Design goal:
2 copies of one chain form a homodimer. Chain A is mainly alpha-helical. In chain A, 93% of the residues lie in helices and 0% in strands. Chain A has 1 helix and no strands.
Chain lengths: 61, 62
Amino acid sequence: TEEELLRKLNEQRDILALMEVKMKEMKGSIRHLRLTEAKLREELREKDRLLAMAVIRKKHG
Amino acid sequence: GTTEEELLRKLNEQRDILALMEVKMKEMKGSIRHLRLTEAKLREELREKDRLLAMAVIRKKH
């Protein structure tokens, strides 16, 4: 039941708890980013399609 | 003499946990840098395709 070991246990708890906060903010950042990517890849694919058609409509017309 | 074996088992346990969580966080910040880059590339690539289309409009307007 040594005083300084216990204080060490708690230091670590404080350290863990901080890390759990950062990880929390990081996994939010990822889910947001994967959704931002997904939306951007969707949009790009729609613009490439529009471009393809613009080229075609000019070649044949 | 060296101290309570309980405390000590506890210190080591949490230490193991600190180290594991450090790993995950190193991966997670990887992911974020690759995802942020990837966002920037795609935004750029969009920015170029919008512009080509805006022109294709203007040139087929005139």
